[PDB]
Amino acid sequence: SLTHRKFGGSGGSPFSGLSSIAVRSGSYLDAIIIDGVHHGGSGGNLSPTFTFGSGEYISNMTIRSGDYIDNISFETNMGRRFGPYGGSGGSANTLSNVKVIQINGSAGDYLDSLDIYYEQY
């Protein structure tokens, strides 16, 4: 049962545990890199690193996928954009008016799957 709980007081600027995103891709996704940590294989080319600013988060995400992840692009609430990186294969699925909280998944030599935790607004 997916939930969240707050602890602590009212001070501070807010932050996410999810700080940055990169991928290795060719015609597939070989890897996703999250806060610098590699998940996947060695194939494809390494994209530049997207680092979220304070209060920035993924609000819109397009992922083409089949048995693997074929492509990823997203947009933030601040208008910045990442991708698309990958091939034209797979089915396109979209997330819109969301807030991505976390990005988990399953990887071998290629990025097989992503489990995207998010708030739907």
Ligand X SMILES: CC(=O)N[C@@H]1[C@@H](O)[C@H](O)[C@@H](CO)O[C@H]1O
Question: Which residues are at the interface with ligand X (CB under 6 A)?
Answer: 66-68, 70, 87, 89-90
47-70 burial, b for 16+ CB within 10 Å, e for fewer?
Answer: beebebeeeebbbbbbbbbeebbb
Q: CB under 5 to 8 A by kind: which of its own copies, ligand X, none does 89 bind?
A: ligand X
Fill in the amino acid letter for 52: F
Phi/psi of residue 120, nearest 5 degrees: -85, 115
Tell the smallest beta-carbon distance from residue 94 to its own copies (Å). 11
Contact indicator for 24, 31 with CB cutoff of 8 Å: yes
Check residue 68 and report its DSSP letter.
S
68 binds its own copies (CB under 8 A): yes
Count Cα atoms within 13 angstroms, Cβ side, for 22. Answer: 13
* Site residues (CB under 8 A) for its own copies, limited to 11-50: 11-20, 34-37, 39-40
Applying CB under 8 A, among 27, 42, 96, 102 the residue interacting with its own copies is: 102
Q: Which does 42 bind (CB under 5 to 8 A by kind): ligand X, its own copies, none?
A: none
Binding site for its own copies (CB under 8 A): 1-20, 34-37, 39-40, 63, 65-69, 93, 95, 101-108, 110-121
